[PDB]
């Protein structure tokens, strides 16, 4: 609802439930569980028609979403470490894949 986040040509996806994600070791699983509220639960993207394939859409969706989230977070005086960005990358990629699938389907 109210996707047009113009912009700029970019659109804002609807909020998605946060998935349980396992990162493969004890320290990161705990870190993630505790910090995952700091990461986006919706993505910014350009219209799917503007991309050659899923990988291209997703790559850009990830970069744009993280960049925008990062500026809003820096405005609040907060900082993302390298672990934050690695974890953000992964979960935002999952959301962008879901967004693409929904956007790609929108052709009926």
């Amino acid at each position, epitope marked *: 609802g109210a996707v047009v986040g113009g912009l700029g040509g970019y659109m804002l996806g609807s909020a998605m439930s946060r998935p349980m994600i396992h990162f*493969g070791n004890d320290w990161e699983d705990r870190y993630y569980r505790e910090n995952m509220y700091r990461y986006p639960n919706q993505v910014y993207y350009r219209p799917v028609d503007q991309y050659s394939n899923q990988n291209n859409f997703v790559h850009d969706c990830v970069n744009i979403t993280i960049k925008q989230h990062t500026v809003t977070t820096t405005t609040k005086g907060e900082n993302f470490t390298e672990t934050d960005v690695k974890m953000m990358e992964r979960v935002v990629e999952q959301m962008c894949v879901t967004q693409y699938q929904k956007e790609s389907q929108a052709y009926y």
Partner: antibody
Amino acid sequence: QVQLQQSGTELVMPGASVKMSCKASGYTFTDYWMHWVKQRPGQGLEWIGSIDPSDSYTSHNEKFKGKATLTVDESSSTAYMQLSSLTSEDSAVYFCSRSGYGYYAMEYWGQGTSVTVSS
Amino acid sequence: DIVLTQSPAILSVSPGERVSFSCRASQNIGTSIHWYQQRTNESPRLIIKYASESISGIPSRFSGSGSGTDFTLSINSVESEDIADYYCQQSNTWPYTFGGGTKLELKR
């Protein structure tokens, strides 16, 4: 009962690649991380890399990044490791294993694929 | 990289005797150490997880203790099927690392 099925042996030419399979059964494939472990004859265990089948996120021993390609096929509940440019250093047994749910002891192990690199 | 040092490299034991071997980590890993038994030409098998937790179908004669950097696996009374190599492994942070192993042999 969980089973992890690996091919017994592979004979491969130096310089060639091999793709080894680990077929899982008896549980929900996407719920657990899969791991790959190398063992040279008469030597110890070495971690190669691990994969989350839910989204194919991976982590590698730095030494194997560029050498071991880890993938899964969700439809066949199968994890794969492809090793490229093989040398005699790659002659070894390769195990796949599966950890717990949000816990990382390696609970189940395949029988291992014995790779021999030779012309 | 967390280095796991196992000692001794070889342990000679008399059937029925109580034995212990040690795993020490170069950094604090809490309880994130797991122990594996590997008999000749077999796969490794998990025998104790998270320092001290027992595993279904593993004989109660196996136990572990420790927290931080110094860990011990003990066998209350060695059946001859316990003759094998024993490895510790940490899962606290990447990369996963393994100890160099302790070999059990029968004293004669």
